[PDB]
């Protein structure tokens, strides 16, 4: 019952462990341990559900215990202890073999095999903790051990590849504890959280390990964002060393998400566009990844409306994220028609949903836009329109008010008109035709430069595969 | 043959609450008749939601009779030994018995064998045609599309002109259902001349459809040629209200009469668009298109008009005209600006190289986009 | 004007008929749009066959 299942689980882990142990110890085969470690994490998580998940208990029981032992005992303490074989070293079946670890030499201290195994064991523990929903004590305890555990060691290119996962859980777990409950302690420890991440980053510049840099920078942005500390984020971004070249595409998409958010709020919209479009394409369309996508579309809807664009209706017509994106859709509508009374009703009713995502603050600002789109409309239609008629239609306060809207609107040149005070009407001046202008050149410059970049990427990629198979034996 | 299409036409009426109560209950009688007669009990179940135990007994009986009959018939047709002739025929018949009671599922299995098993190309096309009709029946359009994509491969393989015609007319209906009217028109005009009906609607229906599309898409010169001077339309005159309304609208559009155009607009809505199943869903869309089109038509020939002149001509008040013009101006089709101070309707026309420049860049952004993503994919792989 | 005999515009409010030469649309721009259209279809087909790699 217990025995069989526990045993199989241990075997499975041991198999995995052996593969990566042979791999990591031979030269600079870096990519191989990295791909393998990733797959593994996935396999392990998938594993837990059936044939137990006391693999962790087993897996501790049959390895050298440096501090593993102390953690395991805490974990057992948490879910009410039991003893049945739950102290490590209770089965000696390493037997001073090199693969299961030379038992004596680990004790003598001439060599250290426990180092990399302990990082990997912390990953496995961490994953189980989050999967399980083992909060409070474990979470604190795990964090408390692991931070000084890593600062006890000295990093290598291979150790750097491993902590690129560990730092994600240190962050995430703390957030979960704020997310349980409000504590006075949570306000203090928030500060400590930032502090340890910041230190590790400085060193990691010196290791020139891109993997960890990228991971770290994303975590650090997310914290500033919750406290709405834009001024401090602005200087942070000016550091400029956030790598892209080596990094996985996920880290580029979280990074770009954050960039869109921070730019939009401090009243930059132009550049904020490039970043949100890019962040949608980089994200995959995975079934578990649908939650991310909705969130990205909420934000996009907003960015555009501020800028003065209309997201296609068509794009949202065939989407299935429908129920969540109902608030956003009605905003788009209000802007598109220029309808003044509609707008206000829309933001009062939906206020709470909008507040959660923190799109709300952007939504207040589209109030200037409602009016502007509605003046855009009257101009396209009419070449001379008495200002007196506009004052009734948009139910504007006084003759002075109607002038001032148009006055300010032409400063960004959205409407491009001329007001005649004395003649008491507006006369359209709009060029319309810009083919004649120099402008067509500029538009095409972007088109051509993007295109040329795609040819270069192709060349470089094409030759690499073919070398690998040609070396290999074949007909 | 007749119920296979006709049921859906009536049933649609029933669904709708747009329809007058007189019509709704005129159709109700028609539906009930054909249930009992074709023994539609499985399918009837589907329709009732969307809308005596003797019926049920009629199923249970007819089914077990029809089943036992065909069972041993088919069993014997397979037993005695030659598949080219008997086994192929027997599967056709099996699909047909499923298609009568509208079980979709068991027909896909039987008519699938027939296609797989080697037979004349004629023979293949003919059989597919039934599967497509069940898609049209069910009021699922994408089901029709996959089938008719295959049918199209076989069309020049077989080379029968007979089935090129039949294919055209099915694809014609599929396209009438989707927004896209451009392909519909091309297919539709040829088929006025030629199509012996097969498991699809009467030629009176088909006539009104060619007239409707013709307005929408066609250039002016080409409406006159192909439609008004149609040999077919002229001989067919009007023996139906629907055909009459659409005809009346065509004559004023071409003649640039505008006073009577608007009564006529209203008439076709009542007597054409709502009875027709496929064009019901596009009722709003059509009238929008037509109202832009007429205003447009008149503006093309005049650099200016006064508001009074234009409004008296269409037969609406000046106030009613103003609110309506301004709907369609930011969507760009009428190409006119409007002065309020001098009451004048100016008509700007600045379409030239500028027009065409904008079309090419917009569509261009899209080709770039697709390309980038497929590039990245493969490189990883 | 509707039949493109003389192609001009009648100005009702001056009592004049204005006359234009035949407009000549840019042939290059029209033929270019046909080519672009085609390129999309091409890429769709290719990609369906490239589904084999993944």
């Amino acid at each position: 019952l217990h025995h069989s299942e526990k045993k199989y689980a241990e075997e499975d882990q041991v198999q995995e462990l052996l593969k990566v142990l042979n791999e990591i110890s031979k030269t600079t085969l870096t990519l191989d341990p990295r791909y393998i470690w990733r797959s593994l994490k996935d396999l392990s998580s998938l594993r837990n559900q059936e044939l137990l998940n006391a693999e962790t208990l087993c897996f501790t029981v049959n390895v050298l215990y440096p501090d593993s032992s102390s953690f395991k005992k805490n974990l057992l303490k948490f879910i009410t202890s039991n003893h049945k074989s739950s102290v490590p070293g209770s089965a000696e079946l390493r037997n001073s073999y090199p693969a299961s670890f030379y038992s004596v030499n680990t004790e003598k201290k001439t060599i250290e095999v426990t180092a990399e195994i302990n990082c990997f064991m912390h990953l496995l523990v961490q994953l189980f903790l989050w999967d399980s929903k083992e909060l409070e004590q474990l979470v604190e305890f795990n964090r408390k051990v692991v931070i000084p555990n890593l600062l006890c060691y000295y990093n290598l290119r291979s150790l750097n590849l491993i902590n690129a996962k560990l730092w994600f859980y240190i962050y995430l777990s703390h957030e979960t504890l704020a997310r349980s409950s409000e504590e006075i302690n949570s306000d203090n420890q928030n500060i400590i959280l930032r502090s340890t991440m910041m230190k590790f980053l400085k060193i990691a510049s010196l290791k020139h390990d891109n993997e960890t840099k990228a991971m770290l920078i994303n975590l650090i942005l997310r914290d500033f964002l919750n406290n709405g500390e834009v001024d401090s984020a602005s200087d942070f971004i000016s550091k400029l060393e956030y790598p892209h070249t080596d990094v996985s595409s996920s880290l580029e998409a979280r990074y770009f998400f954050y960039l869109s958010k921070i730019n939009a709020i401090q009243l930059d919209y132009s550049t904020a566009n490039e970043y949100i479009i890019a962040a949608i394409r980089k994200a995959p369309h995975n079934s578990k990844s649908l939650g991310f996508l909705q969130q990205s579309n909420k934000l996009h809807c907003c960015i555009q409306l501020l800028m003065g664009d209309i997201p296609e209706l068509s794009f949202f017509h065939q989407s299935n994220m429908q129920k969540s994106l109902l608030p956003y859709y009605h905003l788009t509508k209000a802007v598109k028609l220029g309808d003044l009374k509609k707008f206000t009703s829309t933001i009062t009713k939906y206020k709470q949903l909008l507040l959660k995502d923190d799109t709300y603050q952007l939504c207040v600002r589209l109030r200037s836009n409602v009016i502007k789109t509605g003046i855009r409309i009257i101009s396209l239609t009419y070449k001379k329109i008495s200002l007196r008629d506009i004052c009734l239609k948009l139910n504007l306060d006084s003759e002075q008010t109607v002038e001032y809207m148009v006055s300010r609107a032409i400063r960004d040149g959205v409407i491009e008109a001329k007001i005649n005070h004395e003649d008491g009407f507006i006369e359209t001046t709009e060029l319309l035709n810009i083919y004649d202008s120099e402008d067509p050149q500029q538009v095409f410059d972007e088109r051509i430069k993007f295109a040329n970049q795609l040819h270069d990427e192709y060349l470089v990629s094409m030759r690499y595969p073919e070398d690998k198979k040609t070396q290999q034996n074949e007909k | 043959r007749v119920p296979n299409y006709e049921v859906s036409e009536k049933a649609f009426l029933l669904t709708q609450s747009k329809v007058s109560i007189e019509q709704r209950k005129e159709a109700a009688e028609f539906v009930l008749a054909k249930i009992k007669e074709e023994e539609m009990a499985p399918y009837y179940k589907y329709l009732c939601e969307e809308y005596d135990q003797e019926l049920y007994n009629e199923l249970c009986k007819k089914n077990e009779s029809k089943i036992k009959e065909l069972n041993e018939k088919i069993q014997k047709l397979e037993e005695d030994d030659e598949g080219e002739l008997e086994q192929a025929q027997a599967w056709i018949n099996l699909g047909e018995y499923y298609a009568q009671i509208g079980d979709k599922d068991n027909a896909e299995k039987t008519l699938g064998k027939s296609l797989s098993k080697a037979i004349s190309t004629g023979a293949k096309i003919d059989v597919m045609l039934t599967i497509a009709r069940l898609g049209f029946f069910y009021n699922d359009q994408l089901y029709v599309k996959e089938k008719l994509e295959a049918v199209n491969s076989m069309i020049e393989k077989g080379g029968d002109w007979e089935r090129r015609n039949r294919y055209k007319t099915y694809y014609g209906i599929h396209c009438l259902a989707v927004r896209n009217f451009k392909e519909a028109a091309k297919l539709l005009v040829d088929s006025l001349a030629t199509f012996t009906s097969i498991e699809l609607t009467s030629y009176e229906s088909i006539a009104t459809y060619a007239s409707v599309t013709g307005l929408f898409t066609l250039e002016r010169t080409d409406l006159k040629s192909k439609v008004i001077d149609s040999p077919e339309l002229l001989s067919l005159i009007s023996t139906t209200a629907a055909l009459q309304s659409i005809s009346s609208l065509t004559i004023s559009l071409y003649a640039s009469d505008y006073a009577s155009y608007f009564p006529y607009l209203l008439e076709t809505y009542a007597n054409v668009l709502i009875p027709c199943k496929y064009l019901n869903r596009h009722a709003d869309f059509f009238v929008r298109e037509m109202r832009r089109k007429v205003y447009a038509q008149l503006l093309e020939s005049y650099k200016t008009l006064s508001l009074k002149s234009m409004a008296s001509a269409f037969g609406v008040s000046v106030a009613f005209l103003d609110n309506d013009l301004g709907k369609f101006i930011p969507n760009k089709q009428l190409n006119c600006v409007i002065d309020r101070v001098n009451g004048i309707v100016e008509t700007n026309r600045p379409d030239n190289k500028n027009a065409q420049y904008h079309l090419l860049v917009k569509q261009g952004d899209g080709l770039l986009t697709k390309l980038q993503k497929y590039g990245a994919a493969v490189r990883l792989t | 004007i509707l039949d493109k005999i003389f192609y001009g515009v009648l100005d009702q409010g001056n009592g004049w008929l204005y006359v234009y030469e035949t407009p000549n649309q840019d042939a290059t721009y029209d033929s270019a749009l046909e080519l672009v259209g085609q390129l999309n279809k091409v890429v769709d087909q290719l990609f369906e066959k490239a589904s084999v790699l993944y």
Partner: peptide, 27 residues
């Protein structure tokens, strides 16, 4: 071009797996 050369590689890997296996027998 990229895709084309890549089908050719996908074929080459299948060939290469099998050739290796047979070489084990030959040795």
């Amino acid at each position: 071009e990229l895709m084309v050369i890549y089908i050719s590689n996908l074929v080459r890997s299948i060939i290469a797996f099998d050739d290796l296996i047979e070489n084990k027998i030959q040795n």
